[PDB]
Design a protein around this ligand. Structure first.
Ligand SMILES: Nc1nc(-c2cccc(Cl)c2)c(-c2ccc3ncccc3n2)s1
Length: 386
């Protein structure tokens, strides 16, 4: 009968993760800091006996590229995953800040990723949801080791809410979609990510979730973009073997390490330009949805002090998370995003093309297919019952 609260005190929110929010916390005794994910009792997809056993297994595994899990707590309405803190943020968010990115840098990234994977598979743990946000860097620098997050989480939890579940279709193996899968799906995911690092472009793309899924399920892609000239044929080989449709024919994680490209390994300015566009788009569609979530959550109809109808305070604080992602997406500092850029943004956030366009004419009848930030804000609000 272990109580989470009798051990840990919350500090600041660290972000959101799969299945719940991530809260930085501190041991009331030893002062050690930890990242707690809280899973709001989300449906357990297996026995409540299958969980503790896997959790138990996970507590004992150790790899420089795998997140360390320290403790598991459950009360009547929640699950608490107490783990380690990694401060260097997500891989991609870093790379976009780089000014040079090369084939050797990507290889050094992937080789990390394949290490954790291989180790986990030896121990028969599948990830299934491997994606950029589940790759955090240990420290601030640009040669810090990568930790894979949530490895093992999804054999036990389900998910739906487009707020979350965002940016995931690019990476899921076709076989995951049809229901029959094994550890080979984590190899397929890695290939998508390898591909994106060498091109700035997902191998399977589209205007919304379903059309991406359709590309994935059909499973065909090309190197017929400009960006692939500078990219060696050794890499394209590895990519090919990892993005091999039938899982049994697909190359294992172990063997991806012994591949010529990894063992072996200019600059790729195009990939960086593209990867920046991808991250910003991703980051802004997310913010756009969080914002709409925050706006509904107030409730102010249910009517650490910090008292010292002050909802106005927490609306300005949400305006500027949105605004930050807007500014960061507007990289030419024009102040405006085009209707085209809108179509893309509302696409990955699954707002009906006809829905926002209508809302847009409600906000300002005389726009010529560009919105400033305030107009964008006005649109989102109207898209959420405001
Ligand atoms: N999807 C995510 N799940 C977690 C998570 C957190 C604790 C336990 C478990 Cl099982 C998972 C994340 C995490 C992990 C470390 C972090 N360290 C610094 C900042 C954010 C962090 N976020 S992201």
């Amino acid at each position: 009968t272990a109580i989470f609260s009798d051990r840990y005190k919350g500090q600041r929110v660290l972000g959101k993760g799969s299945f719940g929010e991530v809260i930085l916390c501190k041991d009331k005794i030893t002062g050690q800091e930890c990242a707690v994910k809280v899973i709001s009792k989300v449906k357990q997809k297996t026995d409540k006996e299958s969980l503790l056993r896997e959790v138990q297994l996970l507590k004992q595994l150790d790899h420089p590229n795998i997140m360390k899990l320290y403790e598991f707590f459950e009360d009547k309405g929640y699950f608490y995953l107490v783990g380690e803190v990694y401060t260097g943020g997500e891989l991609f968010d870093e790379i976009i800040s780089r000014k040079r990115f090369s084939e050797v840098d990507a290889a050094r990234i992937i080789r990390q990723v394949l290490s954790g994977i291989t180790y986990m598979h030896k121990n028969k743990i599948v990830h299934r949801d491997l994606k950029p946000e589940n790759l955090l860097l240990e420290s601030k620098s640009k040669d810090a080791n990568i930790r894979i997050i949530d490895f093992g989480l999804s054999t036990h939890f389900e998910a739906k809410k487009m707020k979350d579940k965002i940016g995931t279709a690019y990476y899921i193996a076709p076989e995951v979609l049809h229901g029959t899968y094994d550890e080979k799906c984590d190899v397929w995911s890695t290939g998508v990510i390898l591909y994106i690092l060498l091109s700035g472009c997902p191998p399977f793309n589209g205007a919304n979730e379903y059309d991406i899924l359709k590309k994935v399920e059909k499973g065909k892609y090309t190197f017929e973009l400009p960006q692939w000239k500078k990219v060696s044929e050794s890499a394209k080989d590895l990519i090919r073997k990892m993005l091999t449709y039938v899982p049994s024919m697909r190359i294992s994680a172990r063997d991806a390490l012994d591949h010529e490209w990894i063992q072996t390994y200019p600059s790729l300015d195009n990939a960086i330009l593209n990867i920046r566009q991808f991250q910003g788009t991703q980051k802004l569609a997310q913010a756009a949805l969080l914002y709409m979530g925050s706006k509904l959550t107030s409730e102010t109809k249910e009517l650490e002090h910090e008292v010292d109808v002050a909802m106005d305070r927490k609306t300005l604080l949400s305006r500027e998370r949105l605004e930050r992602a807007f500014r960061m997406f507007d990289s030419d500092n024009s102040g405006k995003i085009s209707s085209t850029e809108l179509a893309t943004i509302f696409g990955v956030s699954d707002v009906d093309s006809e829905t926002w366009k209508s809302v847009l004419s409600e906000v300002d009848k005389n726009n010529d297919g560009e919105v400033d930030f305030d107009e964008f804000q006005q649109m989102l609000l109207k898209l959420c019952g405001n």
